[PDB]
Design a protein around this ligand. Structure first.
Ligand SMILES: O=C(NCCO[C@H]1O[C@H](CO)[C@@H](O)[C@H](O)[C@@H]1O)c1ccc(-c2cc(-c3ccc(C(=O)NCCO[C@H]4O[C@H](CO)[C@@H](O)[C@H](O)[C@@H]4O)cc3)cc(-c3ccc(C(=O)NCCO[C@H]4O[C@H](CO)[C@@H](O)[C@H](O)[C@@H]4O)cc3)c2)cc1
Ligand code: CA
Ligand code: CA
Ligand code: MN
Ligand code: MN
Lengths: 237, 237
């Protein structure tokens, strides 16, 4: 299977696979069963912001999710991503729906990776910023149901023309270029990701969520990963 | 055939296809016969810097090549790149040798592209920076004789184990991700590229040069484009 590290915005509690009994943000290392979670006071139909940060000095992956004029949710986990990920990865967003559904709409996405060396004292860097997605976005790999260019947005899961989200949907968008995420001859390796999202459930019973993830370059949507597995994992182990 | 826009650092005077008598920097729009040139006091075996700039406000492509403690060479040409290039491109470096030869060593390369909309009043951007090239650089496409890893450098043309450049060589390195170089909904499109290079000829007779180029995404080395064609053009038209 793929190797996945992900930050989940999990809108539906699957208590049979370790979810707490409330919408939560979580850090996922090679399993949908989050190594750490925090309660998330998710706001139906309002624009949210997710910030993800990692640096190789602290070896700590953290995420903050916020809405205007509300308290943040934050979650952190100590992990050395050198022991978890391959040296080269792709970065992406994933979302899914099941019996229950929501818009998984991305309004903007930015990413920065840096390797600062000293032996050869100069830095390698990648930065991308999408504030507008177009109909034929050739620096994105769209998988499953993901589409671009509807009001300049990335729709990770299927939405009908009148704006109704579909059930049993899964879709992902990966940046085209592979990312050099760690190198054992750097003194500082770091990345940050920001996205703004609009999650709207008409039934106000939302599912299943959005994740930022980092994978092996050749990662694809695993068979049967709709619903609780967020288009990231083949099973619930 | 490919669509090419390029800034050439042309070390060899091919006076039959309109080169001047001396090493020159040139702006190439769909032909090796530069639309504009400037004299370049090229220094055998010293590290140089090239800076390339364009914005859609001035519609002016400019370049400056410099060494420590020396007068720059600069060249500009008015051109509307949205009348020349496709919307989506790749960016790269190219070099060649012919009967005469030189090391075509790249020590660093950075690129920034930005599209500023009025729709969102918000911006799409790509930035990469390589200060070190690794043996397996998965965010580069290498074509022809180009290799990475030797002392952390990119060698666009063939060099022997002791640093002797081979003749009749051609090689290119393209950034993996397509770039969105223009869009008619943007109010400003701009790019900049910077690279440092070490061009060394033991015979003290250098050829043929190095170019920064922008092409169609599926561009490859034209057949027979060693020597004066700099790996960019199928002919001297
Ligand atoms: O326009 C000029 N102007 C003057 C000189 O240029 C300078 O001058 C000033 C000071 O010097 C300075 O102020 C300026 O900077 C200025 O630019 C000019 C025009 C042409 C040439 C030139 C011509 C030729 C050439 C050779 C042979 C023919 C030929 O015989 N054609 C066939 C016959 O055609 C005619 O007759 C038939 C039959 O009747 C008819 O059908 C036809 O229609 C015709 O009428 C034509 C022209 C050649 C050169 C030249 C060639 C080669 C080199 C050179 O250095 N080669 C090295 C080897 O190349 C390989 O290695 C290189 C290095 O690695 C690579 O780059 C290559 O790719 C190869 O691999 C140099 C010059 C010039 C000159 C000036
Ligand atoms: Ca869940
Ligand atoms: Ca030439
Ligand atoms: Mn969960
Ligand atoms: Mn020239």
């Amino acid at each position: 299977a793929d190797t996945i590290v992900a930050v989940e915005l999990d809108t539906y509690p699957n208590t049979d696979i370790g979810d707490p009994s409330y919408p939560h943000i979580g850090i996922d290392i090679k399993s949908v069963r989050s190594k750490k979670t925090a309660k998330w006071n998710m706001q139906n139909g309002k624009v949210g912001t997710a910030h993800i940060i990692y640096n190789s000095v602290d070896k700590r992956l953290s995420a903050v999710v916020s809405y205007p004029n509300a308290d943040s949710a934050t979650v952190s986990y100590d992990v050395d991503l050198d022991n978890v990920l391959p040296e080269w990865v792709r970065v992406g967003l994933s979302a899914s729906t099941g019996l229950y559904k929501e818009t998984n709409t991305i309004l903007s996405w930015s990413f920065t990776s840096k390797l600062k060396s000293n032996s050869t004292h100069e830095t390698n860097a990648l930065h991308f910023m999408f504030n507008q997605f177009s109909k034929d976005q050739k620096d994105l790999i769209l998988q499953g149901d993901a589409t671009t260019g509807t009001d300049g947005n990335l729709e990770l899961t299927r939405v009908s023309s009148n704006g109704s989200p579909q059930g049993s949907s899964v879709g992902r968008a990966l940046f085209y270029a592979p990312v050099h995420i760690w190198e054992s001859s750097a003194v500082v390796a770091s990345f940050e990701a920001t996205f703004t999202f609009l999650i709207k459930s008409p039934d106000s019973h939302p599912a299943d969520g959005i994740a930022f993830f980092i994978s092996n370059i050749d990662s694809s949507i695993p068979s049967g990963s709709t619903g609780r597995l967020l288009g990231l994992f083949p099973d619930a182990n």
